[PDB]
């Protein structure tokens, strides 16, 4: 059950590259693609993310897309750059200018069909393709505008396959340009219709974790992507390693998404680590469980006590007591029962994997479907409206053929999403 991975734009490719670095190490694959690990568990389901080649080489089932070559030359130069299939680098030259419209309608349109040719080549090899995961930001132009264009076209050609995204949300605290609320609002509308599952990675949350908790006075994109790669490793653990569960993307969607449009997950991680800093003390299972439900370990800047959990997934990584994990997990629900909707019984499920990630003896990864995620969309909605009521910065978009109506519609769809989350918070 193969996954086809797509990374789009600057952000998409930087976190995408770090993802392949982190999991390639967990699966024991060197940068040349040769396996030099130690345990058959690392190979049992390597099929999910890697193709095999001559000489038993493992090649990521990964497509790299950008409208300018800058960041993709950087990937090829990077440590694991030589691992990716050269034909899977698909780039233009003109860039997208942090402009959703250039990504979706003009520049990205020139390039989209060549991306679909590579996706098709990778899908056609798959024994049984389960679906797609996309890495991208929503605040720029390529990952946002062209990424969502890809999602639309992939759904047309593979309507019965799962579409999963890791979507980075813009924050004034980590901001390239003032138009990020425009780009994010136009993309969220696309995400609501055309994905089954998106992890809402919020640069506001990552910035705050690096500043407040990790004690990083001036965080870099590198410090933020360390949090992202740890989260992407954790939330794919059950896809990559053999367990009791043998999880796939579709059962994840069936159990996490009680209503089609409410599929925006809040991920969390424990223990939280800055780069280079090694933690010498183990977290007890009680500490893993407390920290992983802590608002301060969430990658979407939402207060979960301001909402309610529709569904929760918790994956524990390491040699630890399964009985203790059950008791502590049950202990969180019983002691906070009001924060889990009573109308989905037993809506917190748990998985354990024996292999810890690199540098930790124990870890926990949290995937929550909370109505508190509306806070994130309201925050972008407010920033959007502050500009839009004066029609500010819109010329960058009307010069690529878009009309004000399309903005009005995008705003309205996202406000509808907010009130829909509100509807189940009071149920």
């Amino acid at each position: 059950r193969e996954i086809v991975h797509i990374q789009a734009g600057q952000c998409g490719n930087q976190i995408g590259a770090k993802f392949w670095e982190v999991i390639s190490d967990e699966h024991g694959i060197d940068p040349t693609g040769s396996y030099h690990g130690d345990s058959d568990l690392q190979l049992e389901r390597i099929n999910v993310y890697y193709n095999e080649a001559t000489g038993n080489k493992y090649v990521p089932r990964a497509i790299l897309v950008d409208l300018e070559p800058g960041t993709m030359d950087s990937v090829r130069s990077g440590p694991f750059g030589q691992i990716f299939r050269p034909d899977n680098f698909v780039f233009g030259q003109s860039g997208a200018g942090n402009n959703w419209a250039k990504g979706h309608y003009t520049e990205g349109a020139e390039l989209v069909d060549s991306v679909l040719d590579v996706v098709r080549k990778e899908s056609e090899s798959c024994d049984c393709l389960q679906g797609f995961q996309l890495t991208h930001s929503l605040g720029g132009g390529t990952g946002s505008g062209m990424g969502t264009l890809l999602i639309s076209k992939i759904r047309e050609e593979y309507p019965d396959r799962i579409m999963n995204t890791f979507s980075v949300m813009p924050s004034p605290k980590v901001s390239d340009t003032v138009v990020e609320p425009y780009n994010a609002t136009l993309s969220v509308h696309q995400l609501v219709e055309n994905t089954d599952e998106t992890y809402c990675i919020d640069n506001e949350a990552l910035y705050d974790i690096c500043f407040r908790t990790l004690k990083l006075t001036t965080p870099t994109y590198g410090d933020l992507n360390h949090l992202v790669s740890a989260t992407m490793s954790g939330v794919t653990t059950c896809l990559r390693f053999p367990g009791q569960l043998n999880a796939d993307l579709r059962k994840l969607a069936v159990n996490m998404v009680p209503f089609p449009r409410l599929h925006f997950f809040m991920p969390g991680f424990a223990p939280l680590t800055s780069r280079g800093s090694q933690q010498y003390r183990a977290l007890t299972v009680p500490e893993l469980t407390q920290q992983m439900f802590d608002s301060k370990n969430m990658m979407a800047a939402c207060d979960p006590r301001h909402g309610r959990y529709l569904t929760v997934a918790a994956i524990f990584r390491g040699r630890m007591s399964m009985k203790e994990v059950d008791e502590q997990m049950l202990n969180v629900q019983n002691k906070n029962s009001s924060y889990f909707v009573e109308w989905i019984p037993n809506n917190v499920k748990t998985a354990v994997c024996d292999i810890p990630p690199r540098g930790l003896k124990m870890s926990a990864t949290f995937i929550g479907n909370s109505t508190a995620i509306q806070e994130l969309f309201k925050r972008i909605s407010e920033q959007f409206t502050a500009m839009f009521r004066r029609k500010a910065f819109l010329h960058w978009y009307t010069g690529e053929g878009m009309d004000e109506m399309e903005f009005t519609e995008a705003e309205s769809n996202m406000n509808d999403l907010v009130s829909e989350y509100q509807q189940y918070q009071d149920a």
């Binding site: 059950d326 008791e327 049950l330 202990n331 629900q333 019983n334 002691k335 029962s337 009001s338 009573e342 019984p345």
Partner: protein
């Protein structure tokens, strides 16, 4: 913090119990239908016992004993007493009773040996000496109601020539310990007893609401044990313990040991306690008869505090501990 839910908003007794719990700082009350509770103070009608004891990581407790309604309906209590060898049938502390249906010949058999013996032959649903009006009554009602030998020679307090019943409060915990609250109450008539007019209602029925002289002899037509014991001493040269309370303890222990096998939650996935109201009748020879067993009793306002605190001590905190005993344990 332990958790509890409240599904009987009318219970005077458990209204207090939940306030005591909340004011401990160690109990949080949850929304009615939240299933992640430690304690269920449940509805009286169709309490979902089949949903209890299926939440992993929660010891669950409920303030009712499934099956205990056999002792607490008037029709069931009669069948239970005639069929269970542990009691029947010359059970000598229950009035000769018979179940009767409206849409009986055994009852006529004793009523006719009553008339052939020309003995006291008055019965109760509602009171009369002629069975015909007891039956002409039963069918123009539309429900099952037993009829029972009315105690024609009841003990009468002085002054007043007045009738009374004794209510005892009994708590049965999850271990099936039987705890008798040391405080009982006498629910008195303030009307002088009248052998010659049973239609005349008030002087025969000792119900706290069905007295609407109320209050003449003591506050609320309620005489508690300190005064009743004092009276039995000055008036009859005996104590309450000797002349009455031994029989009450025997009747309580007897009734509850009988249904133990059918209702105990000893080896069950959920656990039960329940508070009961036993209602007794004392005749002029100081013999105690069981009238009725009440499964959802209220209390008397003087005693609400002490009894509810004791429900927490023995019934709730025994199962969920926190961070000078008002009961008498009846041994078995």
């Amino acid at each position: 913090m332990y958790t509890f839910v409240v599904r009987d908003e009318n219970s005077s007794v458990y209204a207090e119990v939940s306030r005591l719990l909340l004011a401990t700082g160690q109990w949080k009350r949850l929304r009615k239908d939240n299933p992640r509770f430690n304690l269920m103070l449940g509805e009286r009608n169709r309490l979902p016992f089949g949903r209890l004891g299926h939440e992993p990581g929660l010891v669950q407790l409920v303030n009712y004993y499934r099956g205990a309604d056999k002792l607490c309906r008037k029709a069931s209590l009669v069948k239970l007493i005639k069929t269970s060898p542990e009691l029947s049938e010359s059970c000598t502390w229950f009035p000769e009773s018979y179940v009767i249906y409206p849409t009986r010949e055994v009852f006529l058999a004793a009523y006719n040996r009553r008339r052939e013996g020309r003995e006291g032959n008055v019965w109760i649903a509602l009171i009369s000496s002629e069975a015909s009006e007891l039956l002409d009554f039963i069918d123009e009602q539309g429900q099952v109601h037993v009829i029972q030998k009315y105690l024609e020679k009841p003990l009468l307090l002085e002054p007043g020539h007045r009738k009374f019943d004794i209510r005892s409060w009994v708590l049965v915990d999850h271990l099936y310990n039987i705890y008798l609250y040391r405080e009982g109450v006498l629910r008195t008539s303030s009307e002088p007893y009248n052998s010659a007019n049973f239609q005349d209602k008030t002087c025969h029925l000792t119900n706290h609401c069905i007295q609407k002289n109320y209050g003449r002899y003591e506050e609320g037509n309620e005489m508690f044990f300190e005064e009743f014991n004092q009276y039995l001493m000055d008036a009859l040269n005996t104590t309450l313990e000797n002349s009455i309370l031994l029989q009450i303890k025997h009747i309580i222990r007897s009734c509850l040991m009988c249904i133990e096998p059918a209702i105990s939650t000893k080896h069950l996935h959920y656990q039960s306690f329940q508070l009961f109201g036993f209602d007794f009748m004392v005749d002029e020879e100081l013999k105690v008869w069981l009238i009725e067993v009440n499964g959802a009793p209220a209390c008397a306002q003087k005693l609400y505090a002490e009894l509810c605190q004791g429900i927490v001590d023995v019934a709730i905190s025994s199962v969920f501990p926190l961070a000078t005993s008002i009961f008498i344990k009846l041994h078995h």
